[PDB]
Amino acid sequence: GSHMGKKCYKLENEKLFEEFLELCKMQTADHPEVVPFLYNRQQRAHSLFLASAEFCNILSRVLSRARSRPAKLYVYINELCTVLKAHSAKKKLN
Structure with missing residues (x-):
């Protein structure tokens, strides 16, 4: 479209995802x-979301x-997965 509504973080989120990946x-x-x-999860997520502030939020969080809790990495991995499950562009249930 033109704008989601807030600042977009596509590059950041891409990167952050990779940083985390x-x-x-x-x-x-x-x-x-x-x-x-x-x-x-990320690939099948909503490109708008992947380019949205929320993913930045979620990403920056995890x-x-x-890095502080690589044991809780799975928490964060599972989080982001849930996040991506939550904000997938063309989902099904999974």
Whole structure:
């Protein structure tokens, strides 16, 4: 369209996602599937949302938390996944 309504953070969110994703590849050796699951979630999420402030909010939250709590990374991974489950563009249920 023209504007979502607030500032957009597409590049930031993309990056933040990668920042978190790469991070996951570093701490989720037990769950290398988590990145694909993350990627999937994000990829299948709403591009508007991925470019929206909310994802920035969510992302900035989890990344910052994840670096402090790489044990809670799954919390954050699961969060973002839930987030992406929540704000998917063309979902189904999953």
